[PDB]
Design a protein around this ligand. Structure first.
Ligand SMILES: C[S@@+](CC[C@H](N)C(=O)[O-])C[C@H]1O[C@@H](n2cnc3c(N)ncnc32)[C@H](O)[C@@H]1O
Length: 243
DNA sequence: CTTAGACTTAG
DNA sequence: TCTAAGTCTAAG
């Protein structure tokens, strides 16, 4: 199983097998919430349409794809013991927030993801990244994962946009996999959760299969009632809209 | 998760 | 615009 190079909230690593078991065959895989890209990195579609509302994430992905060798060499320099301290971290954070250069920002973004607290990505209303120092003994430099990503990215387009716009990119040859922000246990509003479900319904009647994962709650069962539900116990829910 | 600082609003 | 409750927000 190919691991992602970012430490990202909600890694689909433990559930890959269950996702891949219910993911229909197609020419193209569309992911409105690509995040770290676990499913992308562990499937074999001829092409991918990958999207996310986080512009730093999408920008990072475009650069890793287009300037791999240059990026890896520059990012590797930041993963030395000399950078594993608060003062250095907070300066790199300030450099990130003040940089107007996508490359340098992409470089620093990997550093902050790995050295900051628990791989969080938080912004203030001014758009400034304000995650505190993570206090790790030895952050890991995901070189092997970076190279694998760029290689696999040659068949992927990246778009910064909301789920409604990326799902509209789907066609008869497409399969849609949705990994929305988690529903509440018994940000991403309840309206948007429900709205996502009705878009899936719209796609399944245009003969476009859609797979959605989320927590297994009373709310998710209601939003996804038009779909064939599958429960994964450890509890996760897979909602399959198949023509 | 937690605390601090600040702004908005009812009374 | 008093005063304090109410709400929002930033960041370790
Ligand atoms: C990582 S997936 C969900 C993983 C897991 N379910 C969790 O919440 O921990 C969430 C991703 O969707 C993206 N996202 C949030 N809102 C979005 C929206 N309205 N449209 C498209 N992408 C969005 C975020 O950037 C985030 O990276």
């Amino acid at each position: 199983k190919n691991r992602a190079f970012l430490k990202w909230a909600g890694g689909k690593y433990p559930l890959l097998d269950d996702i891949k078991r219910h993911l229909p065959k197609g020419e193209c895989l569309v992911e409105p919430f690509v995040g770290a890209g676990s499913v992308f990195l562990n499937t074999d579609f001829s092409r991918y349409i990958l999207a996310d509302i986080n512009s730093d994430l999408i920008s990072l992905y475009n650069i890793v794809k287009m300037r791999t060798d240059e990026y890896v060499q520059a990012a590797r320099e930041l993963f030395v013991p000399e950078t594993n301290c608060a003062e250095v971290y907070y300066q790199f954070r300030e450099e990130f927030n003040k940089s107007q250069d996508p490359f340098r920002r992409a470089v620093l973004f990997l550093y902050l993801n790995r050295y900051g607290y628990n791989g969080l990505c938080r912004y203030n209303l001014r758009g400034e990244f304000n995650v505190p120092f993570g206090r790790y003994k030895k952050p890991y430099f995901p070189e092997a994962e970076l190279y694998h990503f760029a290689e696999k990215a040659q068949n992927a387009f990246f778009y910064c946009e909301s789920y409604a716009d990326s799902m509209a990119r789907a066609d008869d040859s497409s399969v849609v996999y949705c990994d929305p922000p988690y529903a509440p246990l018994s940000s991403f509003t309840l309206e948007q959760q429900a709205h996502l479900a009705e878009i899936a319904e719209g796609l399944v009647e245009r003969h476009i299969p859609v797979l959605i994962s989320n927590h297994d709650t009373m709310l998710t069962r209601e939003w996804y009632q038009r779909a064939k539900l599958h429960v994964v116990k450890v509890d996760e829910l897979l909602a399959l809209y198949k023509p």
